[PDB]
């Protein structure tokens, strides 16, 4: 069936360049996105994170099109991430440039047009690590 | 001296609606425009369930910025078509009406008159000439 | 009540466009794509002859409200300028299915053409792709 | 099985106004597109200072055009902006609006249904299924 | 300024020329082609006469100073190309799938150096051509 399988994280100092990959087994309006999980948020600021605040969703980074003739990327990387599609191979990619600590998250392909949603995602990989350096 | 007080802070269940007012006095200087800002609640970086270390020292993110005439509009992403920010020019008071709230909206949320401030370019809170003191937004699961 | 558009015209995909109305309760912007040759027969007929005027965005009289249809909401934002009584919509990371003529309209938020109660005449957004 | 009566034409001053009107009456014209051609007058393409041959040609040319269903209008461009064609649905008739007439603007002008539109060119007069008589137009200097 | 058009000519219909404008600097602003395909007869008695013999020059196209933008006459849109060589001080027309309504006398038109934008309209034209034939035939 539909199998999602990123490559291309690791660790880098802040101001580098990673280039994530995703190959699409057997599947796919339609297209393919990255959605990043930089960690859950303490809604109640009491210094533990528990209930209603492990279902913060992952956040959308970038998303294109089953042509590759739409793309959208979430304001704080436009212009920083290029989202492309290689339909021929398995892979979409995403290339990021100018990393910044703040991008340091556990990031996830994501397959169903351009989806941004996480609701409006179907299969989900099961996700890379990139930890940008605090500089 | 210029000076931003805020109003409008709230505790609702996730969907209602509030809407925040920040009424500025003195010599506003003319050029750019007003902002909101947010601080919410820290992210558990290291994925350990607390709260410590690196995940503490705090920075405001931009919400909506608006031209002094209302004419020019920018907003952070996650906001838009939820949040619309106007201003009353004769007031001299901005309005943030926030509809369709999260959970992940609760924030001390700030208002700011920033001279530099542009519609399609970030404005960095860095740059913010005066801010308000802040109001809590709370919303509930 | 008039409501005289401007800022139209021709752009790259990608590129960007600020429009405005002037007028002379809220106002909106729709708009309606020309003749598609859907089946691609060199004609235009049957259902390709019609074209709906679609909303794109609205503003309460204050400013104070705003709704978008969702495929624009991203890339459009509606503003108003009292006293000069002026509405504009910058437009954003335009592409070619953008391409359309746009229409200024007000009523007495805003979202669907049977509730509008004056027009504007409409200006050419053009996307080259 | 289209019938279509024209009216509307009469004689103005440059600078004036009109409004021609076209009922439609028969079969499935609601199904396709109405618009209005006109016949200006001879060319003296040779420049001898009369008409005469091959320059007595009728040539009926596309002024402006509309969709029955949804409304959509397209025009020949040295009318844009002055010519206003539009359709009553209730009253089965077809308008055009003319304001700003000039000499040029002299013709003899046609109403037409056709079922089918050209795509990304102009509809061609032999394009057209059913004619109406023609109405005359006349803009002094 | 001074504009001299080139490539004129007699063309089977179907078939292409390109026109040539030179101008003594592009200096020259937005610049256009018009067409003159003769005077017509608007009071239908088969004469040539009176205000009959002022009819404007038909713009055809226009390009702005730099060439970013660029304006046609509908019914030759898709058939004509206007590009413009401000190195080579040349302004050019490409005119394919000619037909017999094509037949004219073609003129370059050019407007004041800052006035950049298109030129659309003969009452904007600061400086003009001669004029160069273009005949289309028909069988
Ligand atoms: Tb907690
Ligand atoms: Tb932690
Ligand atoms: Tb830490
Ligand atoms: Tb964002
Ligand atoms: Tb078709
Ligand atoms: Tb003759
Ligand atoms: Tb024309
Ligand atoms: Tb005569």
Known sequence: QVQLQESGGGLVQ????????????????????????????DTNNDGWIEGDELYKAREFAAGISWSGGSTDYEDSVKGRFTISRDNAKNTMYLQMNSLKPEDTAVYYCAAAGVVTRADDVDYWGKGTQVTVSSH
Do not use: P
Request: proline share 0%.
């Open 14 to 41: 802040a101001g580098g360049s990673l280039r994530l990959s995703c190959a699409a087994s057997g599947g796919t309006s339609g297209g393919m996105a990255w959605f990043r999980q930089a960690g859950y948020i």
